[PDB]
From a paper:
We further expand this investigation to engineered enzyme variants by examining the same range of motions in a closely interrelated system composed of three recombined and functionally selected variants of [name] and PSE-4, or ‘chimeras’. We thus demonstrate that a variety of non-native slow motions, including active-site motions that occur near the frequency of turnover, are compatible with β-lactamase activity in engineered variants.
Chimera [name]-19m was most similar to [name]-17m; both include segment 150–190 of PSE-4. Their active-site cavity volume ([name]-19m: 741 Å3; [name]-17m: 746 Å3) is nearly twice larger than the cavity of native [name] (384 Å3), PSE-4 (427 Å3) and [name]-2m (393 Å3). In [name]-17m and [name]-19m it is resolved in the m-30° conformation that swings the Tyr-phenoxy ring out of the active-site void, packing it against the cavity wall. The active-site volume is further increased in [name]-17m and [name]-19m by adoption of an open conformation of the active-site wall 214–218. The inclusion of 17 substitutions left [name]-17m essentially unaltered relative to [name], but inclusion of the substitutions Met68Leu/Met69Thr in [name]-2m and [name]-19m dropped kcat 1 to 3 orders of magnitude, to levels similar to PSE-4. The Y105 wall displayed slow dynamics in the three chimeras, with a 4-fold difference in kex for [name]-17m (300 ± 90 s−1) and [name]-19m (1,220 ± 230 s−1).
Residue numbers in the entry: 26 to 238, 240 to 252, 254 to 290
Amino acid sequence: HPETLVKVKDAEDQLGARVGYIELDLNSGKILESFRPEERFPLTSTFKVLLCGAVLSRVDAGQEQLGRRIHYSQNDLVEYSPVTEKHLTDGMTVRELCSAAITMSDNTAANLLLTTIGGPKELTDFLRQIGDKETRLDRIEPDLNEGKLGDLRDTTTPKAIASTLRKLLTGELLTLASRQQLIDWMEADKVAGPLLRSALPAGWFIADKSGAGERGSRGIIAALGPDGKPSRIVVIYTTGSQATMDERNRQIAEIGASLIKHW
Ligand SMILES: [Cl-]
Ligand SMILES: [Cl-]
Ligand SMILES: [Cl-]
Ligand SMILES: [Cl-]
Ligand SMILES: [Mg+2]
Ligand SMILES: [Mg+2]
Ligand SMILES: [Mg+2]
């Protein structure tokens, strides 16, 4: 809706940074609204959904088991790993790792899952195979969060990842069991949800993944809608701002508030 565009522009002005935005109709994939939809932005932790989609695709193909236990070491632990920090001695199952990676944004969990699939290049190959010609993962956590000026590594476009999310959550790319598991992880309660959850009306559905990185990078991908069912995909990205984190979050949240008000 045009009012949302005005709020996207106001966010650019307040943040001193580009903001990319797309809304899709979930059933049809029709683009309902867009701003800088084909410009590149860092993925940051939004990639963790794509990662777990690649894992679930392997499960469906009999190449991975959700109950397989992954053993790792102290040196595998990277910053912002609140779940994996608690399982050095006992390990974690693949299922537990995806839950941590999505719901808790656990960085080491994502790195371990990347090992299970064979690395960033294998994620990128999975994306290409399902028809995403843009998204790329090149590095692991935390370096993928760098957000360097002029760097194409670890980026997507709003349009590309919106379409990819729709492929993962709807249709037949994943089995029903895997689709539902991915949605369940994305819908699970989180510690704080400033970007969209804070705007979402009661009774509405949201399955989301946020991301935050260096150099102003921030984003969210979501499927949301009224009456306990999703009906739209929304993607919002920004990078480059040196405003405070609170200001970044507030500006993105106001985009979401507009989307809901003008739904
Ligand atoms: Cl535009
Ligand atoms: Cl564009
Ligand atoms: Cl492995
Ligand atoms: Cl959030
Ligand atoms: Mg060991
Ligand atoms: Mg649930
Ligand atoms: Mg809840």
